[PDB]
Amino acid sequence: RDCCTPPRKCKDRRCKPMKCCA
Numbered sequence: 001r002d003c004c005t006p007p008r009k010c011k012d013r014r015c016k017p018m019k020c021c022a
């Protein structure tokens with residue numbers, strides 16, 4: 001939750017597979 005919201009974060013585990021990051 002709360003990661004792709006600009007600017008991106010993609011720090012959390014669940015936020016890495018997220019399409020916005022990858």
